[PDB]
Design a protein around this ligand. Structure first.
Ligand SMILES: *C(=O)[C@H](C[C@@H]1CCCNC1=O)NC(=O)[C@H](CC(C)C)NC(=O)[C@@H](NC(=O)c1ccc2ccccc2c1)C(C)C
Ligand SMILES: *C(=O)[C@H](C[C@@H]1CCCNC1=O)NC(=O)[C@H](CC(C)C)NC(=O)[C@@H](NC(=O)c1ccc2ccccc2c1)C(C)C
Lengths: 306, 306
């Protein structure tokens, strides 16, 4: 029992991190087989980032302008190519530590682990969600670009995020591993403006099930609701609508609680309208929306802490 | 910028985890050089755990009763020995992946990463604190025993925790890697009773500095206080006393905020007495005490998010 914000073990990704330096700029790259993937603004000067022409900056570089280092060993770049906002550096050596892997583009509301890196070395690992406005709430300093986000299925690493930039609100934005940004952002130092963020309703419900799974039951009431009426109340508190697909996804937790999804929706509706009256759930005074239903089952299914 | 509950990268520890089976029971072991360390109750039956005689249970086993597996490869046990609450199994093969490492016994209030494992395989990583009552708030199921807690200094892994048991409150207890329990606990299925937990004051202050470091400044007031008077107020809200050693430890954050420690103490005093009035700090509605001052600097020192 117990419930914590849990990340995936980072070992398989740690073996893929390298340092990429292009003259003035250094950031992290991801070394898979004989290709290093990194953000294309490694080729910018500070001057350039206000509105860079990347194709003109890349045109003026050859393979030898890119210094790639894996620990104490330098990797010779033998080809370079830009795919959307990502640079792909062909290297003379395939990574012996390349795990089984995929490139996936996640959907808003899904979670992943971030391995935060500086100079190609890991600093820490933490769990993030893709927000409905396609930002993430990470923890990233200067030099962190090229850090990746990932899920592990059993031996396969699904890379879904590469870190590119920070928005003044304290929020972060990046690309999938094909270089396409999440959200309406561009890799340029300029004001850009994101959608307003919303609460991931299906994830709050999954966390309420984890709370029940962990003995925290005070919030359960004796009511049910309809999907339509719940959605009318939730909409006012800036919650995403709950779909029947979401209800289906919560089936395992419901049938591992004997609490119908719409009954849990009636409990969440009462929490939204009345607040928590000083009480906590799983130690939190606010409702949590960064655990997916799969996250909860992945962590809890051996518990029952009723 | 941004601030997250960050764990250490788990790769170096992942390479040390093995499965240990003694007849009926399976749990995790830690393989370093040619020794596997695991909880001694691997030798118990369910029957035995109500009040086991470990020396009599161990007396009846030989090296070949212990099945140790590292992935698909079995390791032959060639010697066994009990140190306090930990079993040490000498094996015929030294672990090629043994990192540089130490065994340390941490103090209450310090944090560490937990690599939660089942059947010798990693499930997830998360950050924990040793509570003042020598429990931790982890996330552990059946089969998780032998999971370890650790800090990484730069290439050296300091192992400080091995997981042994759960207390009905949802809290967890274990040993250092020399088999000595943290707190007044014994490895036996019986009611035992812990001290009452308290809030780690120096860690709350470190987190307030991180909040300042991250642009969250509303709670700063124009007052100062004395150490003695702060401690008289904090004592009522079940906070640990702040010592001059604690004030010294907060020096880097203070001199990286230009906020004197006693000025931050005056701000915390006002928060304790008046509450937060609906506001949040770093997204939290409660004060956080599971980040040490070193944790904050480790994560934040490149930020300034004022
Ligand atoms: C890569 O390593 C670095 C990581 C940054 C560094 C700052 C601390 N935390 C991080 O995550 N990425 C950058 O420096 C990028 C480079 C460009 C080419 C993408 N630059 C930025 O992230 C800047 N962001 C902005 O200037 C900015 C983006 C979006 C908005 C939207 C609305 C209003 C303002 C706005 C600004 C930062 C400020 C360095
Ligand atoms: C090891 O794998 C396993 C891990 C447990 C399993 C239960 C789910 N979460 C965990 O962390 N450890 C055990 O099963 C140990 C074995 C014995 C020999 C240490 N047993 C327990 O943890 C039991 N704990 C108690 O029975 C208990 C401890 C302390 C108190 C204190 C006050 C009141 C009651 C009390 C009970 C659990 C219940 C299996």
């Amino acid at each position: 029992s117990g419930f914590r914000k849990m990340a995936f073990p980072s070992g398989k990704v740690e073996g893929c991190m390298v340092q990429v330096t292009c003259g003035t700029t250094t950031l992290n790259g991801l070394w898979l087989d004989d290709v290093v993937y990194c953000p294309r603004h490694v080729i910018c000067t500070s001057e350039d980032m206000l509105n860079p022409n990347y194709e003109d900056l890349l045109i003026r570089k050859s393979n030898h302008n890119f210094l790639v280092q894996a620990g104490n060993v330098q990797l010779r770049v033998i080809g370079h190519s830009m795919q959307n906002c990502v640079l792909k550096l062909k290297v003379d050596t395939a990574n012996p530590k390349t795990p089984k892997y995929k490139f996936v583009r996640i959907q808003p509301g899904q979670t992943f682990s971030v391995l935060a890196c500086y100079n190609g070395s890991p600093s820490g690992v933490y769990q993030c969600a893709m927000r409905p406005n396609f930002t993430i709430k990470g923890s990233f300093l200067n030099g962190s670009c090229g850090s990746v986000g990932f899920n592990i299925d059993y031996d396969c690493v699904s890379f879904c995020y590469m870190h590119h930039m920070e928005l003044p609100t304290g929020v972060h934005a990046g690309t999938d591993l094909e270089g396409n940004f999440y959200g309406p952002f561009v890799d340029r130092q300029t004001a850009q403006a994101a959608g307003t963020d919303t609460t991931i309703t299906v994830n709050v419900l999954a966390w309420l099930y984890a709370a029940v799974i962990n003995g925290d039951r005070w919030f359960l009431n004796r009511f049910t609701t309809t999907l339509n009426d719940f959605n009318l109340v939730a909409m006012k508190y800036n919650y995403e609508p709950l779909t029947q697909d979401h209800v289906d996804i919560l089936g395992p937790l419901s049938a591992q609680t004997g609490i119908a999804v719409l009954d849990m929706c009636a409990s969440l509706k009462e929490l939204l309208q009345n607040g928590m009256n000083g009480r906590t759930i799983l130690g939190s005074a606010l409702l949590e929306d960064e655990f997916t239903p799969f996250d909860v089952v992945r962590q809890c299914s051996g518990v029952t802490f009723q």
